[PDB]
Design a protein around this ligand. Sequence first.
Ligand SMILES: Nc1nc2c(ncn2[C@@H]2O[C@H](COP(=O)(O)OP(=O)(O)OP(=O)(O)O)[C@@H](O)[C@H]2O)c(=O)[nH]1
Ligand SMILES: Nc1ncnc2c1ncn2[C@@H]1O[C@H](COP(=O)(O)OP(=O)(O)CP(=O)(O)O)[C@@H](O)[C@H]1O
Ligand SMILES: Nc1nc2c(ncn2[C@@H]2O[C@H](COP(=O)(O)OP(=O)(O)O)[C@@H](O)[C@H]2O)c(=O)[nH]1
Ligand SMILES: COc1ccccc1NC(C)=C1C(=O)CC(c2ccccc2)CC1=O
Ligand SMILES: [Ca+2]
Ligand SMILES: [Ca+2]
Ligand SMILES: [Ca+2]
Ligand SMILES: [Ca+2]
Ligand SMILES: [Mg+2]
Ligand SMILES: [Mg+2]
Ligand SMILES: [Mg+2]
Lengths: 439, 425, 53, 349
Amino acid sequence: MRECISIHVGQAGVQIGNACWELYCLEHGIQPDGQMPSDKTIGGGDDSFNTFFSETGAGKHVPRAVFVDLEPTVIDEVRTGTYRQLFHPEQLITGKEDAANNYARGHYTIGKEIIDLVLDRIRKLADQCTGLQGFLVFHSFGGGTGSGFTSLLMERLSVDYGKKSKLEFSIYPAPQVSTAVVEPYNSILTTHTTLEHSDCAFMVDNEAIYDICRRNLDIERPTYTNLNRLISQIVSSITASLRFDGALNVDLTEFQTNLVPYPRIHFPLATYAPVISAEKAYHEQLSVAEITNACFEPANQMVKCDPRHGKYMACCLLYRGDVVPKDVNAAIATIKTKRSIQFVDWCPTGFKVGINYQPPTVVPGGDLAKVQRAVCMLSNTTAIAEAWARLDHKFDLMYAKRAFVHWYVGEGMEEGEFSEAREDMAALEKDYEEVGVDS
Amino acid sequence: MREIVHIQAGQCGNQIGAKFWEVISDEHGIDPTGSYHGDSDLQLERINVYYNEATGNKYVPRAILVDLEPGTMDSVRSGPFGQIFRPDNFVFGQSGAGNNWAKGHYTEGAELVDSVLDVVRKESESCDCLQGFQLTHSLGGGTGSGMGTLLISKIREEYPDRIMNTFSVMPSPKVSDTVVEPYNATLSVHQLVENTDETYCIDNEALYDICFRTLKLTTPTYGDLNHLVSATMSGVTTCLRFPGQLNADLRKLAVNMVPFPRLHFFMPGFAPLTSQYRALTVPELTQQMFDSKNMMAACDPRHGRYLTVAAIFRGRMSMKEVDEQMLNVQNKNSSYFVEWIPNNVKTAVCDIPPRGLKMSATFIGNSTAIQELFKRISEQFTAMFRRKAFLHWYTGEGMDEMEFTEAESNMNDLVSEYQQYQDAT
Amino acid sequence: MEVIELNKCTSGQSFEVILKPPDPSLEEIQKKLEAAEERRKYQEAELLKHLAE
Amino acid sequence: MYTFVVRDENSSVYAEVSRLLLATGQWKRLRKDNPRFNLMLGERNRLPFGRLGHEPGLVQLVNYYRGADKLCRKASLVKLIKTSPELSESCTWFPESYVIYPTDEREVFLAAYNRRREGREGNVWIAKSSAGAKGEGILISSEASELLDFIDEQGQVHVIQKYLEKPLLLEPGHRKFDIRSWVLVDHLYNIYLYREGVLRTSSEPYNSANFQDKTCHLTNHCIQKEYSKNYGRYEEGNEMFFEEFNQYLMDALNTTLENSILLQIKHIIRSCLMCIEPAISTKHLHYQSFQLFGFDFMVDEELKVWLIEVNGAPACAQKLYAELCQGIVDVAISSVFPLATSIFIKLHH
Ligand SMILES: Nc1nc2c(ncn2[C@@H]2O[C@H](COP(=O)(O)OP(=O)(O)OP(=O)(O)O)[C@@H](O)[C@H]2O)c(=O)[nH]1
Ligand SMILES: Nc1ncnc2c1ncn2[C@@H]1O[C@H](COP(=O)(O)OP(=O)(O)CP(=O)(O)O)[C@@H](O)[C@H]1O
Ligand SMILES: Nc1nc2c(ncn2[C@@H]2O[C@H](COP(=O)(O)OP(=O)(O)O)[C@@H](O)[C@H]2O)c(=O)[nH]1
Ligand SMILES: COc1ccccc1NC(C)=C1C(=O)CC(c2ccccc2)CC1=O
Ligand SMILES: [Ca+2]
Ligand SMILES: [Ca+2]
Ligand SMILES: [Ca+2]
Ligand SMILES: [Ca+2]
Ligand SMILES: [Mg+2]
Ligand SMILES: [Mg+2]
Ligand SMILES: [Mg+2]
């Protein structure tokens, strides 16, 4: 057994983390007070769920998690929420005033004053680990904390834990649910600084989650609560292999081994199905073929893009529920004869498949109906570069006029970091093109 | 957490500031004696942004009242909600400022400014985490214009990393007290260019025209003008004072609204403005909000381009319909938004409507059309300064002509800077 | 269409199907953070000098 | 009101389409870089498909199908036909073609060429490339060495195709021609064949004993207007339209254009576009596409139709611009953005 430490940074990171740990407790049968009746080894053990939960002598199961925000209003909701008894006060770190959607303020000004404290609270969790795997980092691209302080933390984590793997869950900015305008700056700045320090990053575009909630859940105006509960389902399907018995993606290293042949190109596309409204009184349950086919519909992807016009480097299929290998292969065979699925020449055309027999767990009183089977597909396709091209174009529009740049320079950042970060994104876009497009 | 310190200076500044506190005290359920008598815990969730808690469940505005003569503040202390203010926060002299920026900024005001800063310091030290300052004043007189900008400079010296926003009443010859208002306004604008983060430009001619043409008030008073300002200030500050979508302090808000440091002069608007029991549809609210007749800077937005736009809707309404109508307005006016700041129109909804309305909308525009306002002031300034008319009132307080020449040049540069971003593609 | 590496447990199973074959040091971080803090200090000293004039 | 942007100023078709849209009083044209459009009349090269469909609350439509280039490049059309089972290597309406680089099919082309000279068959081939523009990179020869020496002389990817040595010749004149068909595919992937086509005719007598005189062999409008002395003699601009051509087939061969030729043309158009439908359909995408195609055909003396190439940014006949561009507005633009006896034939599937 090898432990994993989750780190939630900024509002988006904290609220999504709150949604995930709630779901983890439901999946593992852990009550809000931390007790777990099915766990017969009191105060210890090295079961699969112990990768995410430590155990006190009183039988409490404590998340291996740290929450950090530069202002306290979001983490105070964790301190007083349903699962307040789950966390120790030292796991919840709050500053006085936030980074004001300013990467430079989160990275340099405020980050310098709190980074040593965050590392000490993380070190305390690492000291309870007999064989730490590494870290899962949740944050937004657009926030000043989520972008600025995360990149500083990722730098220091590479210093203090050089051997450990680091995985990201990153919220890509969408104007539909944002009142900010500087998020393209913060996204490019944090991607540039974090790129060498992240081994595998799962980007979630709020635009995609928003439309899935509108279209499939019949929610006219999705809230962050709607979005986060759906995101936590996807996150749970990605981390389920670390928390349950299995043989696929059993440690963080396997994520890079299975999904990332080239280090800079470490942004796999996630696709999830089925998403069914709990209010839907009459629903016919979807087959293995139908949910697998839905994995190649752009409308179910975490980032809207067209994989038909890219190339695959790797594809992982993660099923939960009533699924047997025979039905998976029959579905894949049919999909090959109907879909544009092209791999690069230097990779095998194949699928790594994982099946967990426990069907998805849904929050009581949530928007999602329980289904008999679900699947999350993780594919490393060059089509996700469309999301970089969108972001870099918005960056280029504002930066040509130096709009808002004075806010970042005023926090001690130099203007050259903008163009250095943008040139790195230009090289990243070029890498995707060299891998995925013919002459 | 997220406390604001409010300052009101001079006659206009204190009369508008008093109305602001009357309006939001009613919205928060606070009676004239500072006691809470509301019916919703939503009224108290962010009450600390603007009020201090005194023992006895009393709420005291975090407000400082400044003037160089006692008259207007005597009226405030006698006014409707006069007893609600902290008596220690009335800071006043006896001389007056004679509608003279030099007296407010250099002579009479300089004698009083230190004691104002003492009260400011006392209110700041009791703040859990000071979010910033707001000042209400006019630019055409002596105290609000001259001493107000002196105060802003002293505050930036002592609190250099705190946001400073103003509600600034711009003079108009059609609603004028003295002929020297363009001198006072031009001297003040340069101070604001340097030392504020957001300045809401409220033109007295726009307020008058709204009262006359739209509200059908045959003979508007300053009181009628101030009703529009206090309602606008309430709407502008709604998302700080009530729970809702916006989780932003003043700095985050300024970061997203101000793309260039000197171009931070905002054009506010409000809807509805009716002369009355009829329900306003979301299309009606949105259309009137973007209509130049509902804005208060007397600038035609079709004469410039929007750098950033924010709109705040209040009341129970369809957020889906709000989104649809905002997209409809943007397409109708696609030419008037700069295309090099993506997604520069943002909206927020608050479920709590203002007094007497089931729904309302407040407009906050950062438009290059505001240059028309500075052009008007600059023309009126030059028309007198070319003949050095009325200057002896200022040179008699120690100023020389060079400081006027520099103020003129500074505002002409501000106008030039707006013109270059209106032609940028 | 070959299945390989089939592993089975009580919780589920996993396999692979093939269709066809084919850092900055601690001191350097401290240097950057302190360099930005000094640029903030220089800018603030210019503002305070401006206000002193 | 609807908004659109123009990003290809060299399009005669969409200059007229843009003109019609403005004249409706319900469409406003924005600057070419304003992203808040409903309709994009996009650029020919490197159209930024990845930025479409991400503007909140805007339904966005573009006049090009991403991935349709596979049909509209000579090298990739050969590859598509050879490797798609619905088209297959045994496809009967496409001439024997091979892709030649200066992967490559040099040895396989020589193999069939050797066998063709064994049985003394007609061994004439035409070498062409999509990079060579407007009658430049064409070479017709009956000896393979001259083709390949001309290919590697150029640095571009070429295709060698069997030259149709027995073309249908119009009389009088003993002259060659090709048929251009305009095909509109809307956002629902309905396939609309414009009822009006055009024949681009050679005004010189066909001479199979001299393939260097490329005026009686190449039916391009630019080649005939420049090199042929008899330009415009039989028909204005060497353009014969369907009514006359149909009357000719009735008078000369006792058959109709519909029976002898148009059934095959419809079959070919339908086969090509249905083949690439899964790769380019925008049915479940965050943006929608339509596109106008120019199919070019040849007819042999047995009244068999052969597909020559597909143009993805075709021009139109002068006298057909008004009707066709109105049809583009009707079924492709107003179908998605409605306003306040069809000229197309719907090829069903
Ligand atoms: N999906 C999702 N996105 C969120 C959530 N909260 C914020 N966001 C997105 O995150 C971006 C704003 O960044 P925040 O996370 O709120 O900012 P921050 O990390 O707290 O940093 P500060 O600027 O210091 O406040 C916007 O794009 C929001 O749409 C959330 O709970 N769920
Ligand atoms: N296999 C073949 N047999 C006989 N003639 C052929 C042929 N391939 C091409 N041609 C002749 O060459 C002419 C031009 O061919 P092609 O279409 O390759 O060039 P092009 O793409 O520049 C014209 P356009 O762009 O208008 O379609 C045709 O009009 C046709 O008459
Ligand atoms: N809207 C409004 N404007 C005012 C009011 N009182 C004065 N003004 C304007 O303010 C300017 C005069 O400044 P004033 O505040 O009276 O002088 P001060 O006491 O020295 O600050 C002129 O432009 C007046 O038109 C008021 O109550 N409301
Ligand atoms: C980007 O911010 C928004 C987006 C959508 C809708 C509304 C907003 N709010 C915006 C745009 C602001 C401000 O600038 C500052 C305002 C203010 C001004 C003076 C004193 C106190 C508070 C508060 C405020 O609410
Ligand atoms: Ca145990
Ligand atoms: Ca590392
Ligand atoms: Ca004195
Ligand atoms: Ca003193
Ligand atoms: Mg935050
Ligand atoms: Mg007065
Ligand atoms: Mg061509």
